[PDB]
């Protein structure tokens, strides 16, 4: 089960930034990889490790922190498209 995890929290206070660094280090220690800011994912072996990981994430969530969790297949994970910020020739048909 491919576990996609989004993480956010107000970063204004120094304690909030420290909690964000601690939570990020905890995510890296648990096997999660950061694709971009607030974007992470980890490959869970089965539903058991998934449930235990959900409990651990709920236990380690910092104050005011918010985590989104989504279950995704490998075919859907390879279809993940990341656009980081206008074509002259538009082709409708075979792309040649």
């Amino acid at each position: 089960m491919r576990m996609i995890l989004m993480f956010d929290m107000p970063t204004d206070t120094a304690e909030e930034r420290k909690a964000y660094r601690k939570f990020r280090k905890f995510l890296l220690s648990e096997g999660f990889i950061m694709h971009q800011f607030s974007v992470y994912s980890k490959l869970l072996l089965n539903h058991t490790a998934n449930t235990a990981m959900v409990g651990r994430l709920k236990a380690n969530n910092p104050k005011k922190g918010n985590i989104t969790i989504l279950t995704v297949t490998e075919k859907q994970f390879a279809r993940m498209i990341y656009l980081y910020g206008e074509e002259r020739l538009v082709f409708l048909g075979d792309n040649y």
Partner: protein
């Protein structure tokens, strides 16, 4: 419009809310008309509506219709692009043979100079020196035919002595294809200017609707000759795709670096203004 839309697939096209509607069984996509410059239909299975054709005529978008071989068959020519056309017809009838032969001679000099620049970039000193000699030897009425000799020496030097323009090889086919596309864009620009396309600036005896647009498109041929020379080993399909990449690529005008469509539009505008004002300034395009 900035966008060249090419449809090689069977589908139905409609016009809804100032938007081009592409409807197919697999997917449907809407593309705004203001962004669309040229519309190219490369297959015979495409369907369209006369209302979308009227909206394309009002939007002044060039519509090209190809054959089953995908070679262009017929393009749409609007009767009235602008009200200044009816006033420009009297000026075209009032044009002088000295202005026509002068502007055409300067244009041929720009084309031969562009060929000498292409051979100079290709590091041929004798060929570009000979073509430059023919450029310095060009005269009014063209008694020496230095333009045809420059073309024969150009193609014979590029593609080999055994090559010829009358051959049926895919090289001449791609050359006529690029000349047909550039002739279509230049002809559409002449339709935007409003002047008669059938009247040429060189020979009054030759009667052809594409004569004027060819005389205006003469200096830009070496741009097609370059990609044709590089892709000559590739198949005709890949050569056609590389010819389609010319619209995406940009070229350096004397003023600044611009797109091909803008250079053709501004060049045709300066040519028409120079013809009506009797040679105030001659636009020069260099590679």
């Amino acid at each position: 419009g900035w966008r060249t839309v090419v449809v090689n697939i069977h589908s139905k096209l409609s016009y809804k809310n100032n938007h081009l509607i592409f409807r197919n069984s697999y997917k449907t996509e809407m593309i705004h008309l203001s962004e669309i410059d040229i519309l190219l239909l490369e297959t015979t299975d495409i369907v369209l509506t006369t209302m979308l054709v009227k909206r394309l005529v009002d939007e002044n978008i060039l519509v090209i219709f190809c054959d089953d071989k995908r070679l262009p068959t017929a393009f749409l020519t609007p009767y009235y692009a602008r009200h200044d056309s009816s006033l420009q017809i009297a000026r075209q009838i009032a044009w002088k043979e000295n202005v026509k032969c002068e502007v055409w001679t300067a244009i041929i000099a720009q084309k031969i100079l562009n060929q000498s620049y292409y051979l100079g970039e290709c590091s041929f000193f004798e060929k570009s020196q000979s073509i430059m000699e023919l450029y310095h030897g060009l005269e009014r009425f063209d008694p020496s035919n230095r333009e045809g000799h420059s073309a024969r020496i150009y193609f014979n030097t590029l593609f080999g002595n055994d090559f010829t323009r009358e051959s049926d090889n895919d090289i001449n086919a791609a050359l006529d294809y690029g000349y047909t596309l550039l002739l279509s864009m230049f002809a559409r620009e002449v339709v935007v200017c409003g002047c008669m396309t059938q009247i040429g600036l060189k020979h009054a005896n030759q009667f052809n609707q594409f004569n004027l647009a060819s005389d205006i498109m003469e200096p830009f041929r070496p741009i097609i000759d370059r990609i044709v020379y590089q892709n000559r080993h590739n198949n005709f399909v890949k050569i056609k795709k590389e010819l389609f990449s010319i619209f995406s690529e940009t070229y350096l005008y004397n003023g600044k670096e611009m797109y091909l469509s803008n250079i053709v539009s501004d060049y045709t505008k300066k040519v028409i203004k120079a013809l009506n004002q009797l040679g105030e300034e001659i636009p020069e395009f260099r590679i």
